[model samples]
Target chain A: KKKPLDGEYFTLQIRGRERFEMFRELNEALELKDAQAGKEPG
Target chain B: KKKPLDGEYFTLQIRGRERFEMFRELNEALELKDAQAGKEPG
Candidate 1:
């Protein structure tokens, strides 16, 4: 099953490619969310 | 001082854009590592 991964640089490397891609995609998605929110109003 | 960051989706965003960029760069580096490794040391 999928789950959150965490650790130092070496530990992160152990998480492998697919996990890393999930992390990157999640990060970009959130940034895009903030970028959009910063442009919007209440 | 700087150090490792951790947590869930929301918490990761709290680490800010720079940290996220760092993660992306590191992730890409590993991907390139594997891509190159797969090409050599057969």
Candidate 2:
């Protein structure tokens, strides 16, 4: 087994209507533990 | 508005476990339309 990285580039493609709907789907998908609190304050 | 790219690199950190349990969580998160068919049958 190997150690994990503390930071990494997390990317994804949201297809269709480039609107809030796409964001809704992406957000729904990333609902993991600590994930909501994962991003830095923007 | 901007056009989307055909490909991209997705990265993230999976804290804890050097095991299948970690993958199971990631999979559960990416279940989106055309996503299951998103990979190149790899």
Candidate 3:
């Protein structure tokens, strides 16, 4: 159990309309951990 | 307003175990991309 697969790119392609829609999907992961993920000001 | 200079991933870092440093980068791009991005997701 000391081996893993090839792995993925983590990043992908999102065309026109779907680009915005799909973007929401990937971003959900960031919120899974801490609730204060995006509370910090830039 | 009719030019596709180029757009995809603003930044990508998956080496050296870079922590909060890279996080800010990807996090920043997440806030950009569209005129009103990161306002709604999940």
Candidate 4:
């Protein structure tokens, strides 16, 4: 269920027009790894 | 272009039950991180 160096991964959902902006935000959050994000949703 | 730990990141698109199945496979690939899954996709 895990690896050390290359373990980070995900699956996500989005839709056209409704989703383009969604991707922008997604990138933003991933980039930050955020102050609250963790091994599991909190 | 990276950090040592808490650094790995990704962006993905998925949908529906098919996508759920797809995610199962994706998580498998990521478990390897391989020797080649690097700073950028080849």
Per-model TM values vs. the true structure: 0.33, 0.23, 0.25, 0.26
- Top model number, DockQ: 4
Shares of reference contacts reproduced by the candidates, in order, are: 0.00, 0.02, 0.00, 0.15
lDDT of 4 by residue, A1-42 (tens): 334563344555332343346455645554465435545684
Q: Which ten residues in a row have the lowest lDDT in candidate 2 chain B?
A: B11-20
* Residue B40, candidate 2: C-alpha displacement in angstroms: 17
Clashing residue pairs in candidate 2 are none
Winner on DockQ between 2 and 3 is: 2
Clashes of each: 0, 0, 0, 0
Candidate 1 achieves a global lDDT of 0.52
TM-score of 2: 0.23
Pairwise DockQ winner, candidates 2 and 4 = 4
Which ranges of candidate 2 are over 4 A from the true structure? Answer: A1-42, B1-6, B18-32, B35-42
Model 3 whole-model lDDT (C-alpha atoms): 0.45
Candidate 3's error at A36, in angstroms? 11
Tens digits of per-residue lDDT, candidate 3, B1-42, equal 447654553323222233334444545575466646534665
Residues A1-42, candidate 3, lDDT per residue (tens digit)? Answer: 535542233443333443445545445544454356536867
What C-alpha lDDT do the candidate models reach, one value each? 0.52, 0.45, 0.45, 0.47
Q: Which stretches in model 4 have alpha-carbon errors above 4 Å?
A: A1-42, B1-7, B33-42
DockQ of 3: 0.04
| Order of quality (TM-score) | 1, 4, 3, 2
CAPRI quality level assigned to candidate 4 from its DockQ score: incorrect
The positional error of residue A12 in candidate 3, measured at the CA in angstroms, is 18
Better of 1 and 4 by lDDT: 1
